[PDB]
Amino acid sequence: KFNKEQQNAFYEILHLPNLNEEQRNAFIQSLKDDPSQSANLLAEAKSLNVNQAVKQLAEKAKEATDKEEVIEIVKELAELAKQSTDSELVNEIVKQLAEVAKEATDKELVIYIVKILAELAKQSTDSELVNEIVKQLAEVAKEATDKELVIYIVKILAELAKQSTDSELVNEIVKQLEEVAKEATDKELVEHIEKILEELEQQSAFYEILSLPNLNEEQRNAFIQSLKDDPSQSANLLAEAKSLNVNQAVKQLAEKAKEATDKEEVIEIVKELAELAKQSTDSELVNEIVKQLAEVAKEATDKELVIYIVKILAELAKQSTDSELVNEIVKQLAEVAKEATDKELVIYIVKILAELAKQSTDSELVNEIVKQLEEVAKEATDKELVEHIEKILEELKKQS
């Protein structure tokens, strides 16, 4: 025996128009199996009923020869996505509208549907439904054969991007217009899309440069003002900013390492710098990381941390095949050793540079290391240390 809301669920299920009989009887059977789920089944049924509804509508828009019938069907679907509030269904409706457009023989009808989708995106707070509309409009353009349809749709996407604060949507629109231009045989269509892409890319670069966290207010203002004075170089400026942004990030890590009082934290920061340099393929950034590590070692007061950093730089020199970088690490280690006041550290660095020299095939590196150690020995007033360095030097000379 049912109860009011379960019986009402029964009657409603009995009246859903876009279910076939077997789906209705399934939902009724399930309601009789467990009336406590009455709400659930009801909502489930209603969702199914509307989804098949739009499907029915879709095929009626696609079989209709009267250009007004398709306007009424598309308008009905449009009012069903707009005037309703359901997240996943509206996506299905933009996909069906898009198919109706893709198969449309009349350009006016395509323009109407595209306008409707543009208005769904413009009046939407759901980022992923705007992304889906962008995807579908973009596909309509790529498959369109009339030039005017393509121009209209890419101008629509451009206006969607120029009324947006979100950078991911601007970059996604930029990638869809890039694909449309790349698969376009018509040259003036390509040139127009590229002008649009220039404006959009300058906008996006403006937002990115504003969002970069590790530059001060004054170089960010410098970059955006140079962006205003010559927009065409939005790439050249943005690259600059990003490089500078990571550069001053590295220095900040270095400073955060210098000011840490916990050995384990300094170790973690040094691993983050080092293993950022090892996996990064930017030459001057790696250079800056090396000299920042060297400075951390230079002013560090803990023997363990100097040894750790020296070991890190050595490990970077042994696996790197960049000559200027390896000589840069060698000189950095060398002046760490010259300025260090602890014999254990001088001896360790001398052994490290010696290992590098014995590893090296290059005579410029071997003899530069040799002269570095000769300087170190020239400034040492401790006879055990000068003997140590003299042995290392004589073995290095016997090497080659």
Residue numbers in the entry: 4 to 403
Which sentences from the paper describe this structure?
Here, we propose a method for generating proteins and protein complexes with complicated shapes using fusions of alpha helices. To design amino acid sequences that can stabilize the alpha helical structure of the fusion sites, we superimposed one or two turns of terminal alpha helices of connecting proteins using a molecular graphics program. Then, the amino acid residues important for forming a fused helical structure were chosen from the two natural sequences in the superimposed region. Our method does not require complicated computer calculations for the design process and can be used for the assembly of artificial protein complexes with predictable and rigid structures.
We designed another repeat protein using a protein A-DHR14 fusion protein as the repeating unit. The repeating unit was generated by fusing protein A and DHR14 by superimposing 8 amino acids using the shared helix method. Then, the repeat modules were connected by superimposing 6 amino acids to form the repeat protein. The crystal structure again showed that the two helices had been fused into merged and extended helices with a geometry closely matching that of an ideal helix. We also succeeded in producing novel repeat proteins that have a protein A-designed helical repeat 14 (DHR14) fusion protein as the repeating unit. The overall shapes of the two repeat proteins that we produced resemble the horseshoe-like shapes of natural repeat proteins. Each repeat protein family has a characteristic value for its curvature, which exhibits little variation. We have shown above that we could generate repeat proteins with a great variety of curvatures via the shared helix method by employing different repeat modules.
